[PDB]
Amino acid sequence: MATVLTKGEIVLFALRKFAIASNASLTDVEPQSIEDGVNDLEDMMSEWMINPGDIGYAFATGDEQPLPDDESGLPRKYKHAVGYQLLLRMLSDYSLEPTPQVLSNAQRSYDALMTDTLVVPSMRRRGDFPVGQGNKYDVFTSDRYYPGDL
C-alpha cells in the first residue's frame, strides 16, 4: 500500500495520542515500552481472529520475536481503529484513565472498521420446499424441490 505500516508505527501512534512519548508535548521515549507495546499488539491481533474476524494481519512465522520494524500487512484504512483499541488496552500500564473524547473517537473508529466487514448471511430455501410447475422442473431444469444444501 501507500507507505506500508510497520508494527512500530502503530505503537508509536498510540503512545503519542495520549501524550506519553512525543515531540509535541514535552520530550522522550523508552525502549521497554516498545517491546511491551508490540507484544500487546500481537496478542490483540491473535484475539481478533474470533470476534471482529481476520483483517489481514501478518503474524510472525515460526517463533522468533515480532520486532517493531516488521511489516504489519494492514491497509492504511485501519490504523486509527487498531491504534485506539491498543491504546485502550495499554493505558493501565502507566496508571491512567481515558477521557470521554478518547472513548468517543475509539468507538467511532471501531464502528468504521465494523462497517467494512459485514456479511448478512442471507438464509436459503429448505430442501423439502417444492418448486412450482411454473418453472418447468421436467425439461428446462431438473430436481423439483430445492436442493437447499450444497
Binding site: 430442501g127 423439502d128 421436467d138 425439461v139 430436481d143 423439483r144 424441490y145 437447499g148
Partner: protein, 51 residues
C-alpha cells in the same frame, strides 16, 4: 437389404428415435400424474431422502 440383411434395422431404429423425441416431455407428465395419484409414497417423490 431386408430380413437377414439388417439394412432395414437401421431404418427401424432411426424411426424409433424420430418418434420418441417430440413426445418426450409430454409423457413424463402423464407418468408423474399417475404415480402421484396411485403409488403410496408418490406425492413426495423428488425429495424422499432430505434432511
Amino acid at each position: 437389404m431386408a430380413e437377414t440383411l439388417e439394412k432395414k434395422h437401421e431404418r427401424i431404429m432411426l424411426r424409433f428415435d424420430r418418434a420418441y423425441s417430440p413426445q418426450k416431455e409430454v409423457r413424463e407428465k402423464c407418468i408423474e400424474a399417475t404415480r402421484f395419484a396411485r403409488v403410496p409414497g408418490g406425492q413426495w417423490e423428488g425429495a424422499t431422502a432430505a434432511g
